[PDB]
Amino acid sequence: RPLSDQEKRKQISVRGVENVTELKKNFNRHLHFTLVKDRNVATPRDYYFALAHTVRDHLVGRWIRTQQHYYEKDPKRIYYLSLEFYMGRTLQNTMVNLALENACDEATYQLGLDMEELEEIEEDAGLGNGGLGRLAACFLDSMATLGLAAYGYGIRYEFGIFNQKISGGWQMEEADDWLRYGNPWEKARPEFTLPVHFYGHVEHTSQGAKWVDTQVVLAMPYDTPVPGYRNNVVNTMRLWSAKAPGYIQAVLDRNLAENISRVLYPNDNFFEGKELRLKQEYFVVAATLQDIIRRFKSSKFGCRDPVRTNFDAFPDKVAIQLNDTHPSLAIPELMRILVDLERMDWDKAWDVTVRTCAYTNHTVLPEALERWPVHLLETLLPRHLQIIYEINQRFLNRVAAAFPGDVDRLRRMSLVEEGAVKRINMAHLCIAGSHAVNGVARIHSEILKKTIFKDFYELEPHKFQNKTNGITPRRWLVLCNPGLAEVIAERIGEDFISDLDQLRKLLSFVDDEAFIRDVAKVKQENKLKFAAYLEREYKVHINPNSLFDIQVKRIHEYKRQLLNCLHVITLYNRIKREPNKFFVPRTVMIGGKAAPGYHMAKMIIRLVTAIGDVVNHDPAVGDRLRVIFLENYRVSLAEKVIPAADLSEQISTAGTEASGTGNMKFMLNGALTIGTMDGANVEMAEEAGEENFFIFGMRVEDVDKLDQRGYNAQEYYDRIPELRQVIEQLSSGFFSPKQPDLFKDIVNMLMHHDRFKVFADYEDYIKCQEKVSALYKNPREWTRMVIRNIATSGKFSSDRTIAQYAREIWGVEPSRQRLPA
Amino acid sequence: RPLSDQEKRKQISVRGVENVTELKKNFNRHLHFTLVKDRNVATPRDYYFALAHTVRDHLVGRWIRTQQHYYEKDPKRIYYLSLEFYMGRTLQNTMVNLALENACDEATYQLGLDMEELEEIEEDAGLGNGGLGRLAACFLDSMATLGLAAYGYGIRYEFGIFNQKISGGWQMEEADDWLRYGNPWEKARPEFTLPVHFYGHVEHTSQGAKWVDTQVVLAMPYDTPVPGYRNNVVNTMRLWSAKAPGYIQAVLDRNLAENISRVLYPNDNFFEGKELRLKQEYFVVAATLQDIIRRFKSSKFGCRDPVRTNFDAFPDKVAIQLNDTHPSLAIPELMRILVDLERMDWDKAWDVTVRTCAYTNHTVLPEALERWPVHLLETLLPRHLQIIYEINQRFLNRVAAAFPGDVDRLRRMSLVEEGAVKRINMAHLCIAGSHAVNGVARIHSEILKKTIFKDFYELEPHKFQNKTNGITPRRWLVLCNPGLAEVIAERIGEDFISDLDQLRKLLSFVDDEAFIRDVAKVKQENKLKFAAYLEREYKVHINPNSLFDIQVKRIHEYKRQLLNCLHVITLYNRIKREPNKFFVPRTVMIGGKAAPGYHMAKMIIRLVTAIGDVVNHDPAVGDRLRVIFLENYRVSLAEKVIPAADLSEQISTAGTEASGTGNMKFMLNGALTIGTMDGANVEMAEEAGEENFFIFGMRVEDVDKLDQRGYNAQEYYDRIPELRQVIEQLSSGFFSPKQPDLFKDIVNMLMHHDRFKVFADYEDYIKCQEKVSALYKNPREWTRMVIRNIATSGKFSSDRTIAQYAREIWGVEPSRQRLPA
Numbered sequence A, B: 001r002p003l004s005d006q007e008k009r010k011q012i013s014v015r016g017v018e019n020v021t022e023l024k025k026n027f028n029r030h031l032h033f034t035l036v037k038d039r040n041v042a043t044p045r046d047y048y049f050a051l052a053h054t055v056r057d058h059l060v061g062r063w064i065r066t067q068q069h070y071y072e073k074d075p076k077r078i079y080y081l082s083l084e085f086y087m088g089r090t091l092q093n094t095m096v097n098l099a100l101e102n103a104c105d106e107a108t109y110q111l112g113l114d115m116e117e118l119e120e121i122e123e124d125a126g127l128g129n130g131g132l133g134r135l136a137a138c139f140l141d142s143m144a145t146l147g148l149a150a151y152g153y154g155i156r157y158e159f160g161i162f163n164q165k166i167s168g169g170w171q172m173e174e175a176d177d178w179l180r181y182g183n184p185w186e187k188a189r190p191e192f193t194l195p196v197h198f199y200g201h202v203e204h205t206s207q208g209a210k211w212v213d214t215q216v217v218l219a220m221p222y223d224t225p226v227p228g229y230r231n232n233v234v235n236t237m238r239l240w241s242a243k244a245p246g247y248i249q250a251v252l253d254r255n256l257a258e259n260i261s262r263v264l265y266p267n268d269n270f271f272e273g274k275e276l277r278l279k280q281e282y283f284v285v286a287a288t289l290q291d292i293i294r295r296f297k298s299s300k301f302g303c304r305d306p307v308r309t310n311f312d313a314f315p316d317k318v319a320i321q322l323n324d325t326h327p328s329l330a331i332p333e334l335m336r337i338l339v340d341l342e343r344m345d346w347d348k349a350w351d352v353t354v355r356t357c358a359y360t361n362h363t364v365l366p367e368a369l370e371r372w373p374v375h376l377l378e379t380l381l382p383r384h385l386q387i388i389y390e391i392n393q394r395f396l397n398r399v400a401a402a403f404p405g406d407v408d409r410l411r412r413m414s415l416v417e418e419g420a421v422k423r424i425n426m427a428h429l430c431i432a433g434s435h436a437v438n439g440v441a442r443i444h445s446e447i448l449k450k451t452i453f454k455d456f457y458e459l460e461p462h463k464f465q466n467k468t469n470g471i472t473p474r475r476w477l478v479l480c481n482p483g484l485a486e487v488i489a490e491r492i493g494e495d496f497i498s499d500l501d502q503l504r505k506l507l508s509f510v511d512d513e514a515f516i517r518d519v520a521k522v523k524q525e526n527k528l529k530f531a532a533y534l535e536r537e538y539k540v541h542i543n544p545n546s547l548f549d550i551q552v553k554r555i556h557e558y559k560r561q562l563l564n565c566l567h568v569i570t571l572y573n574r575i576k577r578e579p580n581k582f583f584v585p586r587t588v589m590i591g592g593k594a595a596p597g598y599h600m601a602k603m604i605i606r607l608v609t610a611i612g613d614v615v616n617h618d619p620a621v622g623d624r625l626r627v628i629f630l631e632n633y634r635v636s637l638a639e640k641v642i643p644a645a646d647l648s649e650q651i652s653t654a655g656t657e658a659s660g661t662g663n664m665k666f667m668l669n670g671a672l673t674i675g676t677m678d679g680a681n682v683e684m685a686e687e688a689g690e691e692n693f694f695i696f697g698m699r700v701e702d703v704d705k706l707d708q709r710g711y712n713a714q715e716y717y718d719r720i721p722e723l724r725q726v727i728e729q730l731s732s733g734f735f736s737p738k739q740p741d742l743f744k745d746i747v748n749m750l751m752h753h754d755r756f757k758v759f760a761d762y763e764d765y766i767k768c769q770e771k772v773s774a775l776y777k778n779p780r781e782w783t784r785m786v787i788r789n790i791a792t793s794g795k796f797s798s799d800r801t802i803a804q805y806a807r808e809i810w811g812v813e814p815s816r817q818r819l820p821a
């Protein structure tokens, strides 16, 4: 019987083994047909691409079935909105998550290619600044691994975080053209572009509020598959790209409309009020929500008709998690769509809105919070400002009702901030429109409830939660440290990879001679490997037997790279003072990027190199001390240096680091930690036991006691001879002969306006470091303590974090069951 | 025995049938894995892409073997440099050339998809303005079909010729974002980017001339396969894309450097002296020649070492054909590279240069010739200007030597033109640095030798050749008119497809009743099909029995769309005058684009629509006359309307149309021609016999006689009552009631400053048209005359043209032998 076109298309089947032989054929097919190459001209980069496309097929197949599965079941969809997604490399992570690594390694070997070499070819997908963006990345990995119907929505920056170059000891930013050789993992959807409006004005009419005479910029989505660990679950990361909606000049000008998604703002924990950044936030928000609603409506499998027009179930089928306030406009935008476009009444739309959105705070520092001036919002998004004002009036009335007669409270909790410039407090907006607000570490969430968000916590205590951060154990252990992962597996099996708390079992081997020996060996191995990669991809020197003292993270005054520098110089002087005394050999590495406009951070980077130039060439010091500034710190570099570290520097001022995640990676990889009772350090110390940590410095309480009286760095200066010695060297030009005054700003800040009180923790920091070097003299005890750390790092897996987000906020249950293949 | 990496990589084999079943699998694989789609969301566009990628594989496989074959044999490589490549659609052309059409049609049918529908989805690769760009396209097709190791080098404009919209009867240009949904046929080579220098200055040193302090813009090549007809020969079309070599603003500014390859200048037969256009010409030239030399050097198969460092054989291994003067900078650039970079002495470099380059002229019109002012070249390319000056001195000395004492001759032949503005005559540059200069049609090449290039012809007669244009019979017959191709094949077989002269055999059927009937039927069929496509994709009306009077080509005063308009109105008035007289029903279609800045051409487009608004709604006229302006004329539209035409309008002023190619397409497809003895019309008339053509108007000689005395349109006006009637309607506002003066410029030009003498050919044009309508009254005789045209169109195949270029200029012999598969 003649089949109709419908019956025939049923052959359009997802079909077509993870065989070494089959991998070979495909690699061969992609190299020629996809790359339009052959062995006569194929470069290592070409072979890397051939492999990427080969693995990609297996990724794509799973992806399609996963996405088809979500339409079949209609599960509550989780949308993680973020302006950053610090993904890193994808090849190895994909192979390990799909269990293709061994088969692929063999296939390439049989073709005369080295898979490790091909992997090094790949560039980082550095669409992030630091912790916040990397957290989003770990989160996607964990959500897929926990079988959640999760999505990541953000911007596809043509230029991510700048590639940092060092010349003359100074940071030199260079455009990160990460898309130069193309991105094989993404898939453009030029067919699903959506309109985003800007400017214009609002006309209030008898058939609704009309936002007219707007400027339109289109949003084109690019899809990237995100694989869960061996469960065949592949979710989606959706990033938006801006597109245009005297003839020649007009055509050349089209390109200008696309500058919205051109580059990532290089600010970390710092609010820069640029309209372009505001356009980026709205851009991602408007496109994302249109897409979310569109997917919600077309729920029937096999059918693309908008069958689900009723929003009653919207909050039970959708969850929008705001990564910081950057995507906070999602609140008034969702309201705009529902009220203005769907004709829903305000109250009912507000209920849906609040039940859909949840807000995550990542800092308590004033300069990092978003406070957009109203004149800007008014010109760029008049309708949203009108909506923001209404939300505030409704919200303020509730505040008035709960605290009658509290005049100053109305001022404090208002979404509208008066002052030199009238602004809208985005954190206040997020709290008002979210059914949940969470800190990112226990001490941080508590601080929020007691300080900046105290008034809000009193009005709606139920909203406030804590969701201690975490990192994914696939990338931050299995990928970056296979040697350690292997040594661990030999003892407890491979279950820990997807259930990190399993690591506690290692406690039973804290006295095992072989284990102790094998753990130390992996570290040594990693130390050598890094020393190698270091002196082969750059200029470097090593005595891989020296203690690797590492502090990698974005350069910030609050993170205190300067406190570390004071120690370095102090040690230098101490070695010179008593040349006939034994000093534990140490290699102090400091790496991280500074925002271009952050003058002080740049000066700090320059201090590190200036110090190195002196120390690294002092014969009296020999190789008892080496100071290095690790150039261009990024995800792929983190993956190499962290497994090679002995000491993890997590020294931010108590109360400033909301959580930190590098501290977690360090612990998971065999390094001991020296740090303050700040952010997640507190819980790490608690898990491992304080005797197995090098805790030092002021606690949050002490910092406050000092703040109420007034901090006076001079008081410590006048009583610590060693410190004065260090400061005078900086001030007199010892570390800058050519430019005696080079470090004047740094000294003047430390002495007269140090918001992070470096001098207050100096003495205790130096003493703590001595304690560190002492334990290092006892290799057996140093490693047993390491074991005690690794075995208690389970709580810091991002799966645990996500599990709580899913259960305590999203209302979805984690799953470990796998889809077929 | 353990195979080394070298022996292992031998498996990196080109491998992996044109089976309906195999096509199905692949289509299925691409739809899912390549497109990341499935039947649940797949759109017709998605299916078109699935098919494109499927065919592409078979294209790519052949391509690799073809390119590998050229390195194995080291044949003389032919480089066709052009600023335009009017390619059109690729899907059908690829399938027919690879004999995959039937198998693909069946495969799609079995999946419930219509292949014709999928093909309509594809967009034109309109990187051209008109004839010149389309010629380059036909040429690539013919070179591959004649097994020449040929290449096409140009710019990959992000925006080709604007998509023309008509609103209010006016042309409205819209950006041609042809890359919106991606281009599956191209392959980016981000790894082979080359540096292009601009500005800076020259330092003359003891180790050569150094061009320093330049601005650099990179050139990234995109490769597109070009298939020959059933010979498994797939050549390459290489187009260049520009790439970049207050932090945020700096990053946003990177994009500005890429504006060089942003848009195609919409000028046809018109020189606009913009620096950007000059940058485009140098851009394509510098990148192309670096690539040419690089390929020349690495000649050994399997080896990429530059083994061939000696240039002695360069002219026997390379040929650069300049399509017009646009790429003329190739002459001084090649000299720069050889002399400045390769350290070759001038004379020896000049010999190589002249033996490598050949120049093709496409117009004698003064405003179309490139004359770049020296201040511009001096600022943008100082070194090239220095080289241009040297070439001129050397050249002028030779002129002095050949014509001693000829003072004015030195002035005329100089590459440097004095005047209001000092410029460099690029045509003069091309002639001086080329071993061959060719016209593009017999009458044109003769005109060159007698007028603008007369002095040069006297100095070096040997250089001047003629290469009468042609069109490819695959696309312009097999693709666009399968019905006619089929009717023809039934009689003489399929050999004509690659040997057009085979069509002469059709003469034996000029009296065959069935043939006569079948030829007329195909036309009728095409007429209906076009009427359909017309009223379904736009608004249209038809009486497919009316004579289809068509004039499609770029709007120009020299092409005389206005003469056609005068006839249209004359006929309108005639029908109204004698309502009780029989008038052969006619549908006059006029289509074509006007450069944005060409005011007169735009007014002409507006006249066509203005006339239509009146004629098409006059009840007294009924459907005895319909005037239509065919919107957005382009390659894919040409492919639809030309097969449906009865009368081909080729009415340019004698001596102005260098050749024309549309005239050829029309003849090949069954339309009779009404035109002047101009360009290729002359040879067409000669081939078919003048009795089978509707020749009219002034011949070249007459135009000159009138020029020497002075043209006075008033003289014809005062003696032709019917003409005055038409002009007064235009002048008084009959065709523009709302705006009586709308056509004032057109009238004033026709009456007082008509460089193309429309009035001089009016009377004879009208009479000739009457003769046309008369023959149309006799369907049998009209078709027998058609047959006499089609059967003598063989000479106009581009294979014949290319064959002569290959043998008379390039020194390579055409081949019809096929490579294996």
Ligand SMILES: Nc1ncnc2c1ncn2[C@@H]1O[C@H](COP(=O)(O)O)[C@@H](O)[C@H]1O
Pocket: A064, A067, A068, A071, A072, A295, A298, A299, A300, A301, A302, A303, A304, B036, B037, B038, B040, B041
């Ligand atoms: N209505 C549907 N029924 C079944 N699968 C669907 C449907 N809509 C989309 N999909 C699948 O889900 C993937 C992601 O689509 P989207 O959710 O629109 O981003 C598509 O590439 C299809 O494979």
Ligand SMILES: Nc1ncnc2c1ncn2[C@@H]1O[C@H](COP(=O)(O)O)[C@@H](O)[C@H]1O
Pocket: A036, A037, A038, A040, A041, B064, B067, B068, B071, B072, B295, B298, B299, B300, B301, B302, B303, B304
């Ligand atoms: N040295 C060579 N020996 C054999 N084939 C080559 C060589 N160089 C290039 N090819 C082939 O020719 C194609 C075009 O290369 P190219 O000529 O550099 O544009 C490459 O994709 C290879 O398939």
Ligand SMILES: OC[C@H]1O[C@H](O)[C@H](O)[C@@H](O)[C@@H]1O
Pocket: A130, A131, A132, A135, A269, A362, A363, A440, A469, A657, A658, A659, A660, A661, A679
């Ligand atoms: O929440 C993820 C991260 O966000 C920010 O980067 C905070 O500064 C950091 O402490 C936190 O770990």
Ligand SMILES: OC[C@H]1O[C@H](O)[C@H](O)[C@@H](O)[C@@H]1O
Pocket: B130, B131, B132, B135, B269, B362, B363, B440, B469, B657, B658, B659, B660, B661, B679
């Ligand atoms: O040579 C190709 C074409 O070049 C130009 O477009 C000429 O105007 C045209 O007459 C010629 O056919």
Ligand SMILES: Nc1ncnc2[nH]cnc12
Pocket: A267, A268, A270, A595, A596, A597, A598, A599
């Ligand atoms: N990222 C940043 N941090 C601190 N101050 C800044 N001033 C400008 N950019 C800054």
Ligand SMILES: Nc1ncnc2[nH]cnc12
Pocket: B267, B268, B270, B595, B596, B597, B598, B599
């Ligand atoms: N293309 C063109 N032809 C004639 N005149 C023009 N003036 C500006 N552009 C022109």
